Write a protein that binds this ligand. Structure first.
Ligand SMILES: CC(=O)O[C@H]1C(=O)[C@@]2(C)[C@H]([C@H](OC(=O)c3ccccc3)[C@]3(O)C[C@H](OC(=O)[C@H](O)[C@@H](NC(=O)c4ccccc4)c4ccccc4)C(C)=C1C3(C)C)[C@]1(OC(C)=O)CO[C@@H]1C[C@@H]2O
Ligand SMILES: CC(=O)O[C@H]1C(=O)[C@@]2(C)[C@H]([C@H](OC(=O)c3ccccc3)[C@]3(O)C[C@H](OC(=O)[C@H](O)[C@@H](NC(=O)c4ccccc4)c4ccccc4)C(C)=C1C3(C)C)[C@]1(OC(C)=O)CO[C@@H]1C[C@@H]2O
Ligand SMILES: Nc1nc2c(ncn2[C@@H]2O[C@H](COP(=O)(O)OP(=O)(O)OP(=O)(O)O)[C@@H](O)[C@H]2O)c(=O)[nH]1
Ligand SMILES: Nc1ncnc2c1ncn2[C@@H]1O[C@H](COP(=O)(O)OP(=O)(O)NP(=O)(O)O)[C@@H](O)[C@H]1O
Ligand SMILES: Nc1nc2c(ncn2[C@@H]2O[C@H](COP(=O)(O)OP(=O)(O)O)[C@@H](O)[C@H]2O)c(=O)[nH]1
Ligand SMILES: Nc1nc2c(ncn2[C@@H]2O[C@H](COP(=O)(O)OP(=O)(O)O)[C@@H](O)[C@H]2O)c(=O)[nH]1
Ligand SMILES: [Mg+2]
Ligand SMILES: [Mg+2]
Lengths: 368, 429, 441, 429
């Protein structure tokens, strides 16, 4: 309605004193083998009706700044520039969905180049991340023509149909898992636990898995449905469905019947987190659950703080998912990336900021 | 208040408790019958932590004796305190593991664990609120190796957020009392890294050096070896039973003493330790005990602490003391020996002060350290392990019980990562 | 009559609480059964003051006491000791688990289901009072309840009681000796809310009061019984203005306008004159100018810090007993004469004199004895900034190595809360640079 | 007050009462002669419920002993209490059923039931008002199978609105003590579904497990097996004899414990049960008894209650207690085990508190449950039944006594509907 408008007067002054190099989805997104990208959701019509104030600058292609109001020791307003050098800094206005393609392009190569090209989706509740990987891209009714996975699950058959890659006698195969309750449940069986061990070559060896073949870009979506048809875990009407399962979408590439693997993907879904202390456990059940998550997520960046550094030692064993993905952290031809999703709330700045603290341990470097 | 369930596995483990449960009852003043006849009432203030009440003024120790595979059983019943356990808690079977891991964890454990886990839930709901699961067993053997680790997989599953300590007697690097001793170490610790909060890694050779070099004893019997270990146990739960000016929960230890969720392998320590008649030529002070605690020949770990780096230590002090002397002696050690420690940790020592000593003494202490000097021990076992497996030595007593070759490769690389990620932190970084 | 509300948060506060109320009942002639047989003989005075006490119809006097520690082990010494039948038996034990020295277990996970037992118990006790509410919170840093439960206590009482007085006496950890290794983590996570809600934040230290027991008291063996009696003398040298007929009685609110220049910098760093032994009551006169000059020395501080690396902003001289005001102002310009203790430009005035003419009394069973006069300087400085450099560098040491973090992240807190608490202390300790640097022209 | 007629059928049934009638007289303090010598007068307040007066201060148990087919008879007369029954109530015949149902219900019953039903009406009109018809017999055999069900068809006809309990010892699924045991089960229960208000379905294998696993007994005799069953009977009519703060009629049970007029097949339970000398290491409280009552190995039913769903349970408590502890322990069980019960019933538990314990004890209890876990038992008998009938095994001992083939098809489909309509309610609907 009418918050402090001078809040916005503080914002615009930094804007009209500098260059700004925006970034759109109409350019060749080059390759690095590693990154952490960004994409925010647009300001809603409601937030405008409530006069929500801008909080972001997009000064550059690989950097973003937050506009935090503060106060001094005489109640004088102060503004902070949260200078965050990152790799890819996309706007909420530029959502043409090529971000996935620009993220897929390096990865669509690797498995077909014989490598382990993985990813993760990281973001706050209501930050638009279910609109970012699970699809579809319309923002209205999730119209079943723009499945964001299908923008490279097309590639699974179309880049397969690449005559350069038609030479390779390769099979379609993949696997969905459930990292939850400190255990591994199958999304194909799909109520049973499996166990996973290593090889003399320090591979990974699942025990009792269903490996599914498909000639359908929707047949894999059926297994995402049938995979989600477990509808686990921790379901309620809270966060949001709260059916929080760290949903592994892993790929199994090899020849027709040779049993010899020529690469991998693993694209993983974040769980359903709880907004600080706003939730309630009221049970030793839930008091376990979020604790397991908030550790299991934290340890992930650590071996990446070992691998993205880069370093040598690597403790993949505190989390089973890193025991699943100890493989991925080792290959030289093994890409990785991860995505940030943001909400324009000013109350969200307390959490969209805690979002970004998690990815900073690459030791990015602002030269400004 | 919080209460503690006490579990015993292996032929070793209940023999530890058989002296140990005598110590606690003498710490409060309780007969073989359960009739309390202590001196003061201050020992009555936390009876509930181990002992629950019975009908006529009787106290029953909450001890679930899994390891009474029948030869070991009658000795416990025909002991000094066979008339103190509730006889329905003697949960056991027939024709035991036979120093086989798979006969402890895969075949006979499945014919006993349903009879065990129920009796766990019996004493569980008789408690107001739980934290304590003190498993007393050894590595290397049978029941303590396969049947011991089976409960720790299960009781963690029914109780995800409870304190899990296992005071496991480790193998010895020179005195090998078991031919299959590396094959029981690698498998059982592979459970322990996954599902323990802390453990008290104890060797017998360290107990051998302490009883002979320090206590000057001619013939140390296993009751006298374990009485050293029994001193560790009662010292740690001193503050959860007695009012202290700086208290010590198990969880207060189990947030301070562990930096990283995997590295929770502890070495204990105890002082005073002397050999005398009734005239001994010394004087008990705070720097008297302090120098004794940090001695390389006063470890129950069988390693040189000066070879590794202390990650963190725990000084749990008992008896009447003075905090400044306690503070500055812990200060002076971190000063004069700063090159020993992990340097990139601000404080490397914590304290804990109970206010009541044991019966005979006037002051006492309990050292608990966690070092990169225990990096030696698993290196002194995994090398013994990897010589047996390349020649594929004892496989037909294991593959014929329900195991697999891929299980052994999975087992050691768990242990290979600990010694690898102790080298990261013994290095000056 | 104005009043004060005592909340001894956690185990350090209860040990302090064992002596504070002990000292008061000795001052007001009160036995441990709440009676006053001494003024049955005299028959005059309301000496069981509405400052700290009520009165039932039998004459038995009941404190304004309440205290929480989340573990029954500490409070049972009260409920079995000499002070069993003194307090009202709603002493909130209620801990099914000790807080285990982390902030998260704590403000987030187990502070719930206990705080509603507390705040309700407060407002029952608050309605017995008519007028000035003074919260006196007694917590340490480093402990679980002293940091976790304290931070819950402020943002709930700040809503339920508006803008009344909050006097919270934080035992600040030493830059040299810490009895806990995770203690630097608790001592920064409370600072996100200690800075915001709390009115006045005292600091003391053990390593300062250890030196004083060997130097001024000359005892090689300090115990917490003999440590906390000096902090007990600090409080009684404050609340005596709310109790006793003094030449310049000073309300708790008079502290607040004076000692707090800017709304966040309230850290006023108490001292005392404890040179008693009591052979050294002889060989020594201890006039006004004698005990005034004890405030000079960095060896007489209650915080292990040199005052001579910054500026003062305000001071508060509070005198007890046989004190003459002309002797005060004699002992003031001498302190204005010395150019080593130095002020800022923007506070040319400086001091504030408060005079009771009732001296403190002797705690029997050790250690000190009957001195005719006393002093409690209350003075924030800019020198307290470098004590936080002696804590943040400890904090930033074990942050890069991602230590101790799983017992915070898995207990209802995000890891983003740590860099929130870091940039709080990064911004706050920066602001002490803005104070001493004066705008020259 | 209301009074109870007590009937015994079968060789099993009077052997149950022979210990049982000793218990009731010792519950009041009555000699073998009928001379009352109890301690207080509170046990005198409801003598009339079982015992009517005689000439000189003598009390006579209203027990009509149908089953004294003459071999069983003299043993009852040459027992401890042969000198307590009125000898005209020994109603019997010659040349009995011989473990044949039709020889109990069709041929020799017609030559005895007119001598029985008259003696029923004798003790009937000596009562002020009736409710109680406690038939004590077994299934599986002869007289308890054919002659037992004959009275229940008849006494229901003369007394349509009276409480009808039969404490019938069921067959055992493994220990088969009778070759024709499924042929006596299917026929006799076909009477019981039609004309019983409640029944206490009891197995011997459940009595076998209780006497051995829990009571730790070497050689359980049938007097000691049935003494467990005798504890059930006196516990239920405790409140109809003794003043209790929450009373318990048979009909108060028989409106609460039954949802639907056909499904009234109950399993009993009892606590305390222990093995000791005189020192036992426990303590009697309300949660002490509560956990023991709901145990799968403390059922007299020989089934896993966790396999089925409890429709409803009945906690009949004796001795001095406290209602909040009684309430909350029944509350906590329905909370922690809510997936076990029938979920679409608001409360799944009721209580009943008498104020007087038995002689030796200080507190006691009596569990009565009704579950879909008894769906197992008739399934474990009707499968044994249907294997015999397809081969038409024992028909010439039945068709030659006055039966028909169409009677057997009619008999099992009654029983087939119960297991069918227990599947409707063990399902989560
Ligand atoms: C005259 C005198 O002071 O004798 C001492 C004594 O000489 C010494 C050598 C004792 C003695 O201990 C041993 O020789 C010993 C034997 C087997 C295993 C371990 C030790 C002593 O036996 C042990 C005994 O310990 C206790 O009384 C403690 O309460 C101890 N109790 C038991 O271990 C115990 C023993 C038997 C039955 C019940 C309990 C304890 C320690 C920690 C926690 C709980 C209890 C003490 C002080 C002494 C003797 C009697 C000689 C020492 O041990 C302890 C545990 O105090 C050995 O080094 C210390 C130093 C003592 O001064
Ligand atoms: C020293 C002491 O306390 O001894 C107890 C005893 O040790 C235990 C083990 C008793 C004992 O019972 C049995 O061993 C037993 C034998 C056959 C069949 C069933 C039980 C006891 O015999 C049985 C006896 O029971 C009674 O006195 C009741 O009043 C009981 N009476 C009879 O069953 C009875 C027996 C013989 C003659 C007349 C009556 C009763 C129970 C319910 C309704 C009415 C009466 C009691 C408490 C004990 C002994 C004596 C050892 C237990 O049984 C009962 C019925 O109380 C078995 O588990 C309980 C727990 C008792 O503590
Ligand atoms: N001066 C003084 N310091 C104390 C006292 N008790 C504890 N401390 C200090 O307080 C810190 C430990 O915090 P405690 O107050 O003991 O902990 P707590 O608040 O009870 O919290 P938990 O025990 O963790 O639930 C250490 O720095 C101790 O030296 C005391 O009585 N006096
Ligand atoms: N990038 C985007 N562009 C346009 N609209 C968007 C975008 N992201 C989200 N929206 C719209 O914002 C609304 C909320 O998005 P949604 O993906 O449902 O949120 P969420 O993060 O899944 N919330 P929740 O399930 O409650 O935790 C929907 O109406 C979307 O269509
Ligand atoms: N400290 C100690 N060690 C023991 C004891 N008994 C056996 N051991 C050790 O335990 C291991 C053998 O296992 P044991 O417990 O006897 O086998 P189990 O009965 O199959 O569990 C070896 O390392 C022995 O040295 C004992 O009483 N005390
Ligand atoms: N519990 C119990 N069961 C019995 C007893 N006597 C026989 N039985 C059982 O009763 C059945 C045999 O019937 P029984 O009563 O002896 O035959 P009847 O005389 O023809 O009625 C079998 O299932 C036996 O196991 C007894 O005294 N107690
Ligand atoms: Mg959503
Ligand atoms: Mg405490």
């Amino acid at each position: 309605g009418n918050p402090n408008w001078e809040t916005a007067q503080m914002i615009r002054e930094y804007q009209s004193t500098l260059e700004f190099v925006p970034l759109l989805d109409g350019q060749a997104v080059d390759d690095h083998q590693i990154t952490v990208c960004v994409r925010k959701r647009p300001i809603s019509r409601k937030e405008v009706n409530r006069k929500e104030i801008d909080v972001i600058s997009v000064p550059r292609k690989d950097m973003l700044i937050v506009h935090e109001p503060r106060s001094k020791v005489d109640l004088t307003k102060f503004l902070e520039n949260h200078k965050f050098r990152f790799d890819y800094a996309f706007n909420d206005t530029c959502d043409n969905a090529m971000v996935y393609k620009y993220t897929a392009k390096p990865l669509v190569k690797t498995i077909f180049e014989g490598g382990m090209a993985t990813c993760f989706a990281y973001g706050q509740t209501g930050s638009g991340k279910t609109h970012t990987m699970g699809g579809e891209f319309n923002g209205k009714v999730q119209d079943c023509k723009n499945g964001i996975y299908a923008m490279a699950a097309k590639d699974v058959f179309v880049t397969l149909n690449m005559p350069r890659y038609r030479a390779m006698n390769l099979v379609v195969s993949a696997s969905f898992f459930e990292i939850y309750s400190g255990k591994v449940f199958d999304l194909l069986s799909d109520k049973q636990k499996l166990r996973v061990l290593e090889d003399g070559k320090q591979q990974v060896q699942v025990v009792g898995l269903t490996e599914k073949v498909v000639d359908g870009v929707e047949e894999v979506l059926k297994l995402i449905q049938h995979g989600n048809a477990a509808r686990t875990s921790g379901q309620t009407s809270a966060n949001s469905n709260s059916s929080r399962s760290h949903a592994v979408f892993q790929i199994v590439l090899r020849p027709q019947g040779s049993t010899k693997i020529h690469g991998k993907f693993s694209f993983i879904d974040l769980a359903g987190n709880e907004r600080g202390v706003d939730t309630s456990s009221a049970d030793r059940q839930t008091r376990m659950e979020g604790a397991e998550i908030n550790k299991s997520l934290l340890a992930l960046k650590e071996c990446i703080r070992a691998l993205g550094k880069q370093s040598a030692h690597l403790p993949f064993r505190v989390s089973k998912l890193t025991q699943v993905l100890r493989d991925s952290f080792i290959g030289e031809k093994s890409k990785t990336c991860m995505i940030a999703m943001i909400s324009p709330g000013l109350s969200s700045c307390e959490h969209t900021l805690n979002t970004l603290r998690y990815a900073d341990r690459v030791k990015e470097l602002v030269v400004k | 208040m919080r209460e503690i369930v006490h579990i015993q596995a292996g032929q070793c483990g209940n023999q530890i408790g058989a002296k140990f449960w005598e110590v606690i009852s003498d710490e409060h003043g309780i007969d073989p019958t359960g009739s309390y006849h202590g001196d003061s009432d201050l020992q009555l203030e936390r009876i509930n932590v181990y002992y629950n009440e019975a009908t006529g003024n009787k106290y029953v120790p909450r001890a679930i004796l899994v390891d009474l595979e029948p030869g070991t059983m009658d000795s416990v019943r025909s002991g000094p305190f066979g008339q103190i356990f509730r006889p329905d808690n003697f949960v056991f079977g027939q024709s035991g593991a036979g120093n086989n891991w798979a006969k402890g964890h895969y075949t006979e454990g499945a014919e006993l664990v349903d009879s065990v886990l129920d009796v766990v839930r019996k004493e569980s709901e008789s408690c107001d609120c739980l934290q304590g699961f003190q498993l007393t067993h050894s590595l290397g053997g049978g029941t303590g190796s396969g049947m011991g680790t089976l409960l720790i997989s299960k009781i963690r599953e029914e109780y995800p957020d409870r304190i899990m300590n296992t005071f496991s007697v480790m193998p010895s690097p020179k005195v090998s009392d078991t031919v299959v001793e590396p094959y029981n170490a690698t498998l059982s610790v592979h459970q322990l890294v996954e599902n323990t909060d802390e453990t008290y890694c104890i060797d017998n050779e360290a107990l051998y050096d302490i009883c002979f070099r320090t206590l000057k004893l001619t013939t140390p019997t296993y009751g006298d070896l374990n009485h050293l270990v029994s001193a560790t146990m009662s010292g740690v739960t001193t503050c959860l039973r007695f009012p202290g000016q700086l208290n010590a929960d198990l969880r207060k230890l189990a947030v301070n003493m562990v930096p990283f969720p995997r590295l929770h392998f502890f070495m204990p320590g105890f002082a005073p330790l002397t050999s005398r008649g009734s005239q001994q030529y010394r004087a008990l002070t705070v720097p008297e005990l302090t120098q004794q605690m940090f001695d390389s020949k006063n470890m129950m770990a069988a390693c040189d602490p000066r070879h590794g780096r202390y990650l963190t230590v725990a000084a749990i002090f008992r008896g009447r003391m003075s905090m400044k002397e306690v503070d500055e002696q812990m200060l002076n050690v971190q000063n004069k020996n700063s090159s020993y420690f992990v340097e990139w940790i601000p404080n490397n020592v914590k304290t804990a002060v109970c206010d009541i000593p044991p019966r005979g003494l006037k002051m006492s202490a309990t050292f608990i350290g966690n070092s990169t000097a225990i990096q030696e021990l698993f290196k002194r076992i995994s090398e013994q392990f990897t010589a047996m497996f390349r020649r594929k030595a004892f496989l037909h007593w294991y593959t014929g019980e329900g195991m697999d070759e891929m299980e052994f490769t999975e087992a050691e690389s768990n242990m290979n990562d600990l010694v690898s990620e102790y080298q990261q932190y013994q290095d000056a970084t | 009559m104005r009043e004060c509300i005592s909340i001894h948060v956690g185990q350090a506060g209860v040990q302090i609480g064992n002596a504070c109320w002990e000292l008061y009942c000795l001052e007001h002639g009160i036995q441990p059964d709440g009676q006053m047989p001494s003024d049955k003989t005299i028959g005059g005075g309301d000496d069981s003051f509405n400052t700290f006490f009520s009165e039932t119809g039998a004459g038995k006097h009941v404190p304004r006491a309440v205290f929480v520690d989340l573990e029954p082990t500490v409070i049972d010494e009260v409920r079995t000791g000499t002070y069993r039948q003194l307090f009202h038996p709603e002493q909130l034990i209620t801990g099914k688990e000790d807080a285990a020295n982390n902030y998260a277990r704590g403000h987030y996970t187990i502070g719930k289901e206990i705080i509603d037992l507390v705040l309700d118990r407060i407002r029952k006790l608050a309605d017995q009072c008519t007028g000035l509410q003074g919260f006196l919170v007694f917590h340490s840093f480093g402990g679980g309840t002293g940091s976790g439960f304290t931070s819950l206590l402020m943002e709930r009482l700040s809503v339920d009681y508006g803008k009344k007085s909050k006097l919270e006496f934080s035992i600040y950890p030493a830059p040299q000796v810490s009895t806990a290794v995770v203690e630097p983590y608790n001592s920064i996570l409370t600072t996100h809310t200690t800075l915001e809600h709390s009115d006045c934040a005292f600091m003391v230290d053990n390593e300062a009061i250890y030196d004083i027991c060997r130097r001024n008291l000359d005892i090689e063996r300090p115990t917490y019984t003999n440590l906390n009696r000096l902090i007990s003398q600090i409080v009684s040298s404050i609340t005596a203005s709310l109790r006793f007929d003094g030449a310049l009685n000073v309300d708790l609110t008079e502290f607040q306008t004076n000692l707090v220049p800017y709304p966040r910098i309230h850290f006023p760093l108490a001292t005392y004159a404890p040179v008693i032994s009591a052979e050294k009551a002889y060989h020594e006169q201890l006039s006004v100018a004698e005990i005034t000059n004890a405030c000079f020395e960095p060896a007489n501080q209650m915080v292990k810090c040199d005052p001579r690396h910054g500026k003062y902003m305000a001071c508060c001289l509070l005198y007890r007993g046989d004190v003459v005001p002309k002797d005060v102002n004699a002992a003031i310009a001498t302190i204005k004469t010395k150019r080593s203790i130095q002020f800022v430009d923007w506070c040319p005035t400086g001091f504030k004199v408060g005079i009771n003419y009732q001296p403190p009394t002797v705690v029997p069973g050790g250690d000190l004895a009957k001195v005719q006069r006393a002093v409690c300087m209350l003075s924030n400085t800019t020198a307290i900034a470098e004590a936080w450099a002696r804590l943040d560098h400890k904090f930033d040491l074990m942050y890069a190595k991602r230590a101790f973090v799983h017992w915070y992240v898995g207990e209802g807190m995000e890891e983003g809360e740590f860099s929130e608490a870091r940039e709080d202390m990064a911004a706050l300790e920066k602001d002490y640079e803005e104070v001493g640097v004066d705008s020259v022209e």
